[PDB]
Every structure is written in C-alpha cells, then in structure tokens.
Design a binder for this molecule. Sequence first.
Ligand SMILES: Nc1ncnc2c1ncn2[C@@H]1O[C@H](COP(=O)(O)OP(=O)(O)OP(O)(O)=S)[C@@H](O)[C@H]1O
Ligand SMILES: Nc1ncnc2c1ncn2[C@@H]1O[C@H](COP(=O)(O)OP(=O)(O)OP(O)(O)=S)[C@@H](O)[C@H]1O
Ligand SMILES: Nc1ncnc2c1ncn2[C@@H]1O[C@H](COP(=O)(O)OP(=O)(O)OP(O)(O)=S)[C@@H](O)[C@H]1O
Ligand SMILES: [Mg+2]
Ligand SMILES: [Mg+2]
Ligand SMILES: [Mg+2]
Lengths: 139, 517, 517, 139
Amino acid sequence: KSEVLNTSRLKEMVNPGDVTARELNQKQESFQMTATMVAASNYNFIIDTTDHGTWRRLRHYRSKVKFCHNPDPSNPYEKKEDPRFIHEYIMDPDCQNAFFSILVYFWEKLQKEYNGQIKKVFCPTIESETEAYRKSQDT
Amino acid sequence: IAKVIYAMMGNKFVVDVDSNGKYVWFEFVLPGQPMNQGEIWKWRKEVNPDELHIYISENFSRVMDRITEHIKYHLSQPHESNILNYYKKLLKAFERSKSKIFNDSFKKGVIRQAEFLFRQRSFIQTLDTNPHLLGVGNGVLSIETIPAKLINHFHEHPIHQYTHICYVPFNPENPWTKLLLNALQDIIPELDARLWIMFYLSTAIFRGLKEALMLLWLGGGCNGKTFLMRLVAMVLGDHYASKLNISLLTSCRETAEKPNSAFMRLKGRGYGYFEETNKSEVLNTSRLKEMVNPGDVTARELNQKQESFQMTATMVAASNYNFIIDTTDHGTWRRLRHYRSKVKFCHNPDPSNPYEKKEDPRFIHEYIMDPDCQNAFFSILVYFWEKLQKEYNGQIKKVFCPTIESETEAYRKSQDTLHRFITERVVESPSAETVYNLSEVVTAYAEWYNTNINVKRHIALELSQELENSVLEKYLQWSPNKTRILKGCRILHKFETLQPGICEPKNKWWEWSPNPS
Amino acid sequence: IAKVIYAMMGNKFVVDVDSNGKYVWFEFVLPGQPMNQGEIWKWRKEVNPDELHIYISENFSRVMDRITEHIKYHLSQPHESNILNYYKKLLKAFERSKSKIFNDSFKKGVIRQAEFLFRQRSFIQTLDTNPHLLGVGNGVLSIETIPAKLINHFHEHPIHQYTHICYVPFNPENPWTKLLLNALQDIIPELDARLWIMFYLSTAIFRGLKEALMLLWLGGGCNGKTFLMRLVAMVLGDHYASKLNISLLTSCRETAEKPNSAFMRLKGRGYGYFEETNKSEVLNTSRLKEMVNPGDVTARELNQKQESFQMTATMVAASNYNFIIDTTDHGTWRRLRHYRSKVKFCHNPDPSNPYEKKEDPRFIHEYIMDPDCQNAFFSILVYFWEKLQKEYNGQIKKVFCPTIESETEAYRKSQDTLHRFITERVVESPSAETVYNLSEVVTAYAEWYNTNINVKRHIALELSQELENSVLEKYLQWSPNKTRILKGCRILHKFETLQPGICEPKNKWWEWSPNPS
Amino acid sequence: VLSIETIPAKLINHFHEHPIHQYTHICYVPFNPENPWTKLLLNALQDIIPELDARLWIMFYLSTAIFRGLKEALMLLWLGGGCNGKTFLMRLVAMVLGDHYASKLNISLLTSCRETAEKPNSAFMRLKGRGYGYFEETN
DNA sequence: TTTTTTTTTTTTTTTTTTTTTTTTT
DNA sequence: AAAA
Ligand SMILES: Nc1ncnc2c1ncn2[C@@H]1O[C@H](COP(=O)(O)OP(=O)(O)OP(O)(O)=S)[C@@H](O)[C@H]1O
Ligand SMILES: Nc1ncnc2c1ncn2[C@@H]1O[C@H](COP(=O)(O)OP(=O)(O)OP(O)(O)=S)[C@@H](O)[C@H]1O
Ligand SMILES: Nc1ncnc2c1ncn2[C@@H]1O[C@H](COP(=O)(O)OP(=O)(O)OP(O)(O)=S)[C@@H](O)[C@H]1O
Ligand SMILES: [Mg+2]
Ligand SMILES: [Mg+2]
Ligand SMILES: [Mg+2]
C-alpha cells in the first residue's frame, strides 16, 4: 500500500557523494554509489517535508494506460494484455540483444546531444508531474 | 600414470569445482556394482574416488605385467652389448617402480594430479537443468516427448537428483490403481472439479516455467485434503517436494533477507504444500506476489550472502478455515483459485448423509508404506500430465470447468469488508447527508470492522480513494474548500429501522471423456 | 597387506561414510574381549580401530613367520645357481620389510588403504531402523513374533543403540514383580482404567508408527504420577526415551526460531513425558495437532541443517492443573484422552479415607538404582505387549474401558467457554429482542470471559460461524440489509432478576479375565 | 581421600583403586573439640543461633552438604535482618567444601520469575556433582 | 530479540620424503 | 668407483 518516508536514508543515496555502513559481518570499507534509482508503485508515496533541495532532486510521473482483457473502442487509453509478453519473451536472448542495442543507441544519442547532462533535456510532462506532486503531498 | 588412467577409464568420472572452491568427484553408476537403491544410470556425488583407488591398484597391474613380459621377451632375442646393460638397467628400474603404484602417498599424489585431467568445465551448473528429465528408481524418465520414454540404458544426460519410486506405464487394470482411482473419485464428488484439480496436480511433475496460478481451497474438517497433499509429497520425493510453512504466506514476518531456511526451500523443488490452519488466516502481499509470479528471485543463504534461485514449484494451500484477504486489485485476484469440499466422513454414516462416507482408519496410517501405491500414483500423475499436454498444450488456464472459477468468484464477492459496510450502513439509507470529508465515515468504518473483523493500524489515504472504488461516490461533489464531501448517506447505529431512502461418468472418468468432458 | 587383513577378519569391521563426509569405523563385539556394560552381540561406534592396530602388529606376526620358514625350507633343498643369489636376495628383502609393520606411519597408511576394502555402502542409514529389535543388556531382543525371542548369539542385525536393562522371562512369582504389581494396582483403583493405561504404556516399547493418541490425566496433587513416569523412562533407556519440556507444546504460536534443539528430540526416542505444570495453562497450538499426528515433520538444529524425521513416540502429560482447551476440532479431540486420579497418599491414613494410603519415603528415593527393579518392571511391560498383540492385534483404539472416554467426554463437556455462556445469559431467557449483528454478540461474549476466563485477541471467526455451530441458530434471520440480525432474545448481561421463557479381580488382574474382562 | 562409606569416616593416604579426580584443598583431621579454633568456631556458632533444637536441626541439614548422592527434596530459606551474619555461614561452607563441590548461583534463579525459551543458559548448569548451593539478598 | 552465539574456522602441515656418506662390493 |  502507500508508504510513508522522509529523509530516512533518502538523501544519503540521492546524492552522488559517499556513504558507509555495516558490511555484512565487518565494519565498513566505503560506498561510492553510481547507480540510477527508480521507484515505481501503484500507491502514492507519503512525503512530509518542505526542503527545496529534496524536491530539487526528485521527479514524478503518472502513466495513463491500464490494459484490459475486454478493451472496448470507448477505452482509448488501454489495450489488450499479452499474458506471454511477461511470462516469456525474456527467455529469448535475441530480445535482450535488441534491448541492449536500443539502450546503447539511446545513451550515444544522449552523449551526442546533451553531453551526459540528463537534466539538460526538456520534457513538458517531466517536472510538471513532479511539481504536481509538490502541489500535493502537503498536509 | 594419471594420463594413462584418464585415457583408460576417463569416460566414467567427472571432476568439477564446487561453490566453495573444492574439487568434487562424480561417478557414473552402472548395473552390477555396489550401489544404493534407485541410483542407477545416473551420476552420484563421491567424497573420494574409492573404486578408482582400488582400480589403480588392481586393473593397472595387468598392464604392468604386460610391459614386464614385453621387456623380458625383447631380452630373450639375441642382440649386442645393448642388452648387456641397457635392457638390464631398464628391467631393474621398472621393477623398482612396479611396487610404487601400491604406495598410499603415491596413490594420493596420483589422484590429486589427475584431478586436473578429469576436470570438466561447466558441469555443476548444468545439473538437473533440463525439466523434462526426472530421476526414478529404475533409471531416468524423460517427459520431453509424448509418450514419455523410460531410459534404462547408457546416455549422456546431466541428471543427479532422483526419487526411489520405480515407474511403470499407467495401467488402469491394476488393483491398487483401481482402488486409488475409486477413492479419489469419492473424495471429490464433482467430475469437472476432480479433473481440474488432478490436471493442476499433474503440473508438479514438471520443473520448468509454469503459469502463475495459486490454488487454495476449503474443505471439511475430516475431508482428507492432507491425505492428498502428503501422498503427492511422498510420491514426488524430498528433492522435489517440501513442506513449507503455511504461516509463511499468511505472515511475511521476517524479511526474506533475514536468515530464512525456508527461503532456501523452493529451489529446484517441484512441490510445496500448506498444512491445515488452526484458524482463519489473513494475508495480502506478505511475500504473496513474490511467490505468485514465476520470475527469478534472490536467495538469502541464511546468514551467508545473497544468491538468486529460480522458482518453478507448484504451490497449494489447503485448510478448513477461510483466509482473510484485504485488497481490491484485480491482478491479485486473477492468479488465485478457490474451491470448497462437501465430504465430511463419519464412522456412523446414515443413509441421510450422501455427501460423506465411512472413514478408513488405515487409509492414512498405512497405504503410503506400500511402494506399489506410489508406483500407481506416479503412473496416474504421468498419464494426467500427458493428457493435459495432448489437449490444452500445457495451458492450465485454457481448461474449462464450470464449478471452478464459480466458487472462486463467489469467494471474491465475499471477503470484502468495504462492500459489507456499504450495503449494510449507507446503502438503502441515502435520504440524509452527514459527511466530514468522509473522515467520520472512515473512522466509523475502521471502528466497525475493528470489533467486527479485526483491529489493525490504519491509514487515512487507503479509503481516501477506495471510497471512489465503491458505489458510494454516486453523489459526492465538494465545497468551495473542496473537502470532497459526500452528498448523501445515513450513519446508522444499533437496531434503528428501515427508514425510507456435472455429468456423471458412465463407467470411467479417468478417460476424461471427449473434449467437453 | 590390507587385502590380506580384510580376507582374514574382514567380517568383524564395517566402514561407512557419515553425514559429514568422514569415514567411521564400527566393530562387532564378541564375548571374551573388554567392553562397556551392555554392549555385547551388537555393533559399537569406535573412532580408531584400536584392536585392529594391535591385531596387525601381533596376530599378523605369525603369518610373517610362516613365510620365513617357507623360504628357508626351500633354501634348504639343494638346487642350481638360483639358490646362489635368488633365495638369498628375497630373504634379505623380506626381513627388511619385516620390521616395517611395527612402524607408525606404515600402519596409518594401511588403515587408510583398508577404508576402501571395508567400505560397505548403505549401512549407517539402515542402522537401528527395524522397530521390532531392541538393544538390551544381554543381547538383542526381537518382538517380531509371539513370544518375543532374545538373540544372544551371532547374527546380522544392524543394531547399534541399546538400553542397559538385561531381559529375563516374565515371572509373576518374583518378589519384586509381586511388590510392583501390588503397588501399581493400588495406584490406579479401577481395573478397566488400569488395563487401558498399561496397554497405552505398552506401545512405548514399539519404535514404529503408532496410532495418533495423546494421553493426559488429572487427579490428586500428590498422587505419585512422577514415580511411574520416571520408572518407564529409566527402564526404557535414554536412547529411546527423553525428557521433553512442556514449553514446546505450550509455545504461544511461533513454529520455531531459526535454530531449535529441544524439538530435535524424538529422533529415535520412543517415549516422552510431560510433568506437573505451574498452573492451569492453555495448550492449543500448531504443535497441538502438528506434533501428535504420525505425519513426518521437519526442523533445523543450529549448525545441523533443516532436515525431517518421522515422529515415533508416545506422549503423556500428567499434571494436577486442568489444561485450558479452546477449540471445536473433533479431530483434535480424537487424539486426546483424559483420566482422573483418585489417590492422595497421606502420612496419617485413617480408615475413613479408603481412596489413599501411606507414603513410602524410600519408594521413590530408592527402589530405582536396584537393577532387579528395572528388570522385573521391564518384564511386566514386555509381557503386556505380547498380550495386547494377542487380543487386539496391536490396536489401541479398539480396546474397551468404560471408565475411560467417559471422564474424557465429561472433560469435553467442560473446557467449552462458549457452551457455558450459552445457558448462562441467553438460553432460558429467549423472550425479548436485543440482539444486533453478531459483532455485538462477539463483544458481549468477549467481555464476559475476559474477566471470567481470560483475556484473548477476539478475532471475527469466534462467532461469525459459531452462532450456527451452537443451539442459538434456531432463530437466525437477516434484515433487508442482511446483517444476519438474530430474531432477538433477552441478552440481559449478568443474571439480575429471573429468566423469562469395575469388577474386582479374584486374586490376579494381570491375567486380565476373559475377553469381556 | 576421605571415605564416608562406613562409620566412622576413614582417611586413605596410601595406594588404592577408586576412580576419583575432583577434590578440595582442605586437609582433613579427626574432630578434636580441644583445638582453640574448634572451640572458637563452636562458641560463635552457638551464639549465632540461640535455640538448641534449631541449632541441631540446621547444622544436621547443612551436614548433608558433604554427601554428593541423591538427597530428599528439602528447601531451606530463613529470614533475618541487618548484619545478621547470614553471609558468614554461607561463605564459610562454600570455601570449606571448595569450588569443585560448592558454587554460587544467581539469586534471580530462585525467583523463577524469569523464563527461558530455546536459547543458551549457563547458570542452570554448574550444578553437576555439587552438594551445596547458596544464595544472597535480593532487591 | 536479537545477540552472540554461531559460525567458522582452524590447525594443515607435519612428518617426511628424498637422501645418507660411508660402506662394501 | 659404483651400488646399497
Ligand atoms: N476414499 C476413501 N475411502 C475410505 N476412507 C477414506 C477415503 N478418503 C478418506 N478416508 C478416510 O476419511 C478421513 C479423511 O479425512 P481427514 O483426513 O480427517 O481430513 P483431513 O483433511 O485429512 O484433515 P485431518 O487428516 O483430520 S488433520 C481419514 O480417516 C481417511 O482414512
Ligand atoms: N504404591 C505405593 N506404596 C507406597 N508408597 C507409595 C506408593 N505409590 C506412591 N507412594 C509414595 O507416595 C508418594 C507418591 O505421591 P507424590 O510423590 O507426593 O506425588 P507425585 O506425583 O509423585 O509428585 P512428586 O513428583 O513426587 S513431588 C511418594 O512419597 C511415594 O514414595
Ligand atoms: N559468631 C560471630 N562471632 C563474632 N562476630 C560475629 C558473629 N556473627 C556475626 N558477627 C559479626 O556481625 C557481622 C556479620 O553480619 P553481616 O554479615 O553484616 O550480616 P548478614 O546478615 O550476613 O548480611 P549482610 O552482610 O548484613 S548484607 C560481622 O561483621 C561480624 O563481625
Ligand atoms: Mg488432514
Ligand atoms: Mg510424581
Ligand atoms: Mg552479611
């Protein structure tokens, strides 16, 4: 369901800096994280803060397609599921090869255009959906 | 010597490095050698190659004597000063080396050296990967093609796990098979439900990817569900079937990350069953969807590091108490199935109780100890899986059964506290309006099922939208301050008042009948 | 050398690999050698074959001497130039090899080499598996056929565990047997109950699958329960009996924490007992029915992995505090039997108290360390087991005893909080209408026994169906809003105002009397 | 080694065959009331407990501490106040008997209020072979 | 209830081996 | 000087 969270080890992983913590059964060595984070859910996240910096390093979106097994013409923002589309199509290595090619091509496009600055690109939906969250989530 | 031995008996031994970095020897079993029951025509794990140790001391001696004989024969023929000293020195050195093969330190060194020669890269991780091969007492059974082929001869399949249940082709004429079929028909009266449940159970033989379906059905207190669960688990074997904790799904409790030996279960297993519950159990997403979907999952080796094991076993949960489900998502209530039994065995069965019969006290205490019973059950399961493959091509969701998915949807119409409150307290009484942002309604609903159903921590936002996920939002506009105030209801308390506002099989049912069945 | 040794005395030793992957040595004990008490005619576990080391260093010497005579005897007879050098060289080589056996490094390698020759596959897991064989002080006891036969000579039974109680044929004329029979009869005045209890205790000697039955009996505060409980365990031995903690059966709800050692009892133990409790306590748990049933169970013990073992033992729970039973499962009630003691030994026994006698201070403090007491008592139990097999063919449920199952069913009519409340506030006062939905009846029933009986987490199921599982459903309808509103009755919390609306044996009882008895 | 098998007790200071290994470092001598220490202890002991019958009964109970076999189930607890000298008597016996046969256990154990689940417990141990257990004051 | 006990080591080679120079062929 |  919906989850409540605020700065609870949030900014420590948000920033590209360095943190450190328990290492299984040891003390620590170092944590230089470089991985992109994504958190998709069907329940609204509860945030209770007004820090400008936290909202600065945040993005929000909301998809509008909810496929149905009985899709009528009156439902434009949904279609028919393919049960095998998730159950299979991942086992075929050719699918991963094609997806990897797509990812490499898109990364090269990003490097060519905005030179590695993800925030340099402009998307009307992006930020707008994020500031919409800012407009919300404020008791 | 290691090279000679590898060239000599090298097709029978395989050495591979374990997960801990220790070399392990595997032996290929053949008839006519000391062995455990049911371990024929397939590989086994060996601590040290003992029979290789006796082999290097027994069989190599004949080759040694052949070399000695050849040397002596060459010495016999007339020659020149070469046989004066060279042949004699070779004979002396070879004689001194002959006894070396018997030395224990020498033998250990030879074995350690030949570990590298017998090394075969990429062997452990490809063990039991084929799901169409199942280990059996009389060899290996292949279900890749219909009909399934029993292999009792030489092969090259990487099969090591097994069960000690000998396999025979499905023979309905067997007395034990007929008795089991009749008993199974009696336990579940409906033909269509019987067939559907048997087809679902036959999927436990397979070990590959399967459709994400969960079976959970109710039954009588003395129904006999646990008999079927224990029988299936016994027939499949420990390596493929294991008894998981019913509460596990009901209560996620500690995270999988937290040391869990049950998390090390479901790895390679083909069966996991839930025991009877002492009472009704509530569960929702408490490691539910993780066990539901067939995707690969991690593997927390108790206190050790975090592995990843693929899960494919069939999960079944049987109880005499219902289970509390608190959710509305269609996806969760689309990979579940429900059924209810109707047989409550009695030791004084009057004619006025057709939906029950006399117990057999020895039906559970014994009748599992007979190996013939497991053979018959295994044949039945194999035959049913073959029938499913023939008809629906492995698609369990494709088979139709009217009584099933009807009890399931009936259960879906139940186990919904929100609808009870709706068509108990507000519906049929819309002729008023008292709503404080539905917050009063949320609190009333919460306290209502706190005493009515159960007490638990609440979140205001869960009903902030679930109210619109009902028939309540038929009249809900909002004030200038929004507040989404409902436009009609009546908060009712106490008594108040009503204020204005299938076909029976002919002789055989295992024959499945034609496609309509 | 190892080949010669195995061909010479190889039948006396067996080498098998343990579960941990370490070779283990087993020696068969024969009379005429040192041994621990009660370890005759059966296999024993030995870390190092010490008797073998002295055997290869002493007994093997004479075989060496026979070689020494043979070579010189052939040397004595005149021959050609072969005896000039051949016999001389071999004799020098052999005498050099003579002293090699007395070396230590040489002997270590011999033992390691002989581990392959003496290896016997599938030997540990088939040890102590036959339930009809019991290790006794004077050999091994077989209860396969009536009468039970004691084997005290050579055999091939794979038996390793034992108890140190020497067996003698049952003699009722023995003074210890006479005293034990008299005291035991006085302990339980009822003949039929005495017959029923002894038969149940007789199954403890068995080590195979048994009828699922739980014994618990009540009575006097100082009856003498622990005397009989201690005697059976002491006689039947530690290897087959264990002290079981009551907290395991009375754990709150959790199945097990990640390690568990107490539950790993009953692995080979054929008997476990439960003692007096601090106070009346509830025991309705998962283990209430999970442990009692003959189905196999699995658990983990710390470093030991999470394996399974068949529960094979008889459970008895004697106390003076009545156990709080709260369930409606007829299956659970099947496993349980109840009895009440009626003897309270007193230090001032007057004739006006026939249901008691004088204590014997030395009855428990001593009379146990005497081996003859154990031998006589064990004979009594063994005789009973043969007798029970003769009459009821080893079926404990089919034995008849009028006083048992009568006090038990009277106990069943108790420990029913709901039924007690039924004829307390609503029944006998049905002429009113003050019954809302079942939630209010849940609350009303909850608050009653909250102080009258105990506090408990009142979940919905306690009356969501028990209303139909009662006598109050005769008038149970639902409104247009459903709600299952009862037709109503005088709830009337509290009770204010009125409510409107055997045969004594002649001289011997172990003779059991004829079949009716 | 001191033998209490037969009356009177006999001391073995020569060769024998009894498998005994544990001991205490207190030398044994025949009981002589004429020793100044024997009189000194007896006088103080007599003053500690005034009643003759109680004095006899208590010390007869404590005399069983030498024995190491099975004993009748008797629990002795008694009340005092202030500097009553109770600690003196328990402490004297413990060292006299020695650690191999006497030991001190947590007073909480006596309370029995604490309950132990499936978990290691050490204070329950140490009672093997001993013949004397003494406690102290509580909160 | 982790917690710390449990785990998990943790000795792991070591001796030896060979030679051994002398001896005695 | 080479083999034990
Ligand atoms: N086909 C059958 N013919 C004869 N007896 C049967 C048959 N099927 C079941 N029984 C008996 O009826 C009972 C089966 O129901 P139960 O086993 O009591 O129900 P359950 O689901 O197994 O829960 P349990 O076993 O009570 S914990 C057993 O006593 C069986 O021996
Ligand atoms: N048949 C008998 N003849 C003589 N004395 C007996 C007999 N049976 C029991 N006693 C004695 O009477 C007492 C038996 O009752 P209790 O021992 O007080 O009750 P209990 O169930 O044994 O509880 P505990 O464990 O002994 S405190 C013991 O002192 C026995 O020695
Ligand atoms: N028999 C005795 N002869 C001489 N002095 C004694 C004797 N018994 C007790 N005392 C004195 O009284 C004191 C003993 O009392 P305490 O040991 O203080 O009290 P307790 O009851 O043993 O427990 P504490 O120590 O007060 S918590 C010592 O300081 C002794 O000097
Ligand atoms: Mg059952
Ligand atoms: Mg007792
Ligand atoms: Mg003091």
